[PDB]
Amino acid sequence: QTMALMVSIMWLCTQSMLENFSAAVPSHRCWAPLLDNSTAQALSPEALLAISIPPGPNQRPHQCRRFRQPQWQLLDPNATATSWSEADTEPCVDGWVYDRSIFTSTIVAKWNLVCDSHALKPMAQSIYLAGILVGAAACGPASDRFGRRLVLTWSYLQMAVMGTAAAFAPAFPVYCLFRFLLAFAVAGVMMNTGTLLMEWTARARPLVMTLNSLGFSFGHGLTAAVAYGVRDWTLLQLVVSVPFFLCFLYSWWLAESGTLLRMPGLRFRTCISTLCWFAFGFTFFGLALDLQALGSNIFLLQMFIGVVDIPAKMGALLLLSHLGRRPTLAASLLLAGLCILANTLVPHEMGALRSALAVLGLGGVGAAFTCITIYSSELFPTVLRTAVGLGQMAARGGAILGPLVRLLGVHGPWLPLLVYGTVPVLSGLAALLLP
Numbered sequence: 263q264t265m266a267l268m269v270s271i272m273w274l275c276t277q278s279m280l281e282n283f284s285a286a287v288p289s290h291r292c293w294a295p296l297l298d299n300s301t302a303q304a305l306s307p308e309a310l311l312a313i314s315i316p317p318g319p320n321q322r323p324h325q326c327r328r329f330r331q332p333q334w335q336l337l338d339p340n341a342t343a344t345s346w347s348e349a350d351t352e353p354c355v356d357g358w359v360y361d362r363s364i365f366t367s368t369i370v371a372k373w374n375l376v377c378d379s380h381a382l383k384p385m386a387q388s389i390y391l392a393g394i395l396v397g398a399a400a401c402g403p404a405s406d407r408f409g410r411r412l413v414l415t416w417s418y419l420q421m422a423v424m425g426t427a428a429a430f431a432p433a434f435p436v437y438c439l440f441r442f443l444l445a446f447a448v449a450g451v452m453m454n455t456g457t458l459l460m461e462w463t464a465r466a467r468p469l470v471m472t473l474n475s476l477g478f479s480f481g482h483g484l485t486a487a488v489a490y491g492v493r494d495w496t497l498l499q500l501v502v503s504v505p506f507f508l509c510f511l512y513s514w515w516l517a518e519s520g521t522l523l524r525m526p527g528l529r530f531r532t533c534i535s536t537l538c539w540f541a542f543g544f545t546f547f548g549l550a551l552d553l554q555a556l557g558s559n560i561f562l563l564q565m566f567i568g569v570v571d572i573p574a575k576m577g578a579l580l581l582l583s584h585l586g587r588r589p590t591l592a593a594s595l596l597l598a599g600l601c602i603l604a605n606t607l608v609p610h611e612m613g614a615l616r617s618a619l620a621v622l623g624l625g626g627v628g629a630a631f632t633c634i635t636i637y638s639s640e641l642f643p644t645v646l647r648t649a650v651g652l653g654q655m656a657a658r659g660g661a662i663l664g665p666l667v668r669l670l671g672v673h674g675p676w677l678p679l680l681v682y683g684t685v686p687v688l689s690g691l692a693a694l695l696l697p
């Protein structure tokens with residue numbers, strides 16, 4: 263049934279977007295004696311925070327440095343500001359405390375993802391996407407040998423097990439391994455769902471496709487409410503993985519009640535298709551995992567993303583039927599690129615406009631994915647149609663490289679978004695030359 267696959271892809275969407283909320287970084291500072299000790303520390307907590315922690319980014323108290331001694335010189339206005347020396351600070355060693363207003367417990371606040379380990383969250387996303395790649399590369403022969411239903415049930419069981427395991431992970435490497443196995447099973451489910459929806463009915467192939475995307479969509483759209491309802495990441499992952507335990511009931515139908523010629527042949531079409539897939543995967547998995555910086559409210563941002571991505575990718579099929587395949591694809595790619603570029607061009611004070619631009623860019627990359635996945639079925643004849651698998655592998659590689667460019671935020675907060683806006687523009691300019 264199509265409804266079962268839609269529910270499955272919606273829950274896989276919740277599992278995928280779980281990383282955007284469980285790895286959210288709140289405003290943090292490390293333990294200070296004049297702010298977290300007993301009453302003897304004294305009134306005016308802002309003055310205590312100012313004299314105990316030097317200023318930092320965005321004219322805020324430094325989230326990564328603490329004063330070893332209380333600097334009373336900055337509190338009295340008669341003295342010159344920024345008079346403290348660098349030697350008076352200590353490397354924020356006494357452990358970090360986090361704001362429990364928005365999120366009560368996250369993977370950043372649990373394992374102390376701080377300056378020295380700030381690359382762990384993008385490294386965790388990269389490990390997840392590498393697990394996705396390994397699963398997509400491995401479950402192929404497994405599905406061809408052991409059957410699609412058996413590997414589907416095994417992947418569902420693995421998703422459930424790894425979800426319940428990562429919900430209670432005591433260490434960071436163990437959590438990374440759990441996420442790697444969960445991503446392996448996610449990729450297995452993805453491959454099986456794609457292989458089944460490609461040939462269950464198909465003329466109706468574009469309709470079925472539009473459909474699994476209206477899918478991941480209703481998804482991010484429902485995962486925002488789930489993240490808003492459950493403030494603890496452990497119980498959040500638990501209640502996200504329980505639906506997979508429920509879907510495991512359909513195992514065994516209720517108990518019975520090669521192709522390397524894609525590179526030399528059509529090399530131009532092959533490289534262009536792989537470039538578009540790489541660009542889409544890169545942009546999507548680089549933007550959909552850092553929504554905290556793209557908007558002011560992550561939940562409202564995701565809800566707006568979904569409610570605007572529904573009609574865009576709905577009319578994407580009308581555009582494909584009326585205007586063609588290449589023109590609408592190039593137009594959507596250029597629109598997404600221009601939106602992500604204007605997201606950096608606009609100042610950060612226009613939060614609503616930044617959120618709107620991010621939503622428009624995500625809708626554009628979704629429409630571009632729809633266009634390219636409809637066009638890949640006609641770029642190559644039946645003899646060459648594993649070009650689709652090669653494009654999928656290229657998109658997975660782009661997804662993997664996605665979080666790796668986010669490390670450039672030290673050189674500037676706009677560089678990752680600058681790349682996320684520049685890559686789709688070049689992708690559309692290259693796809694414009696398609697026949």
Ligand SMILES: O=C(c1cc(Cl)c(O)c(Cl)c1)N1CS(=O)(=O)c2ccccc21
Nearest residue numbers: 456475478479628631653654655657658
């Ligand atoms: O990862 C993939 C993916 C990769 C390949 Cl190679 C595929 O063939 C397919 Cl169908 C999906 N995503 C991530 S997503 O947000 O679910 C999402 C939403 C909409 C379209 C694709 C897609």
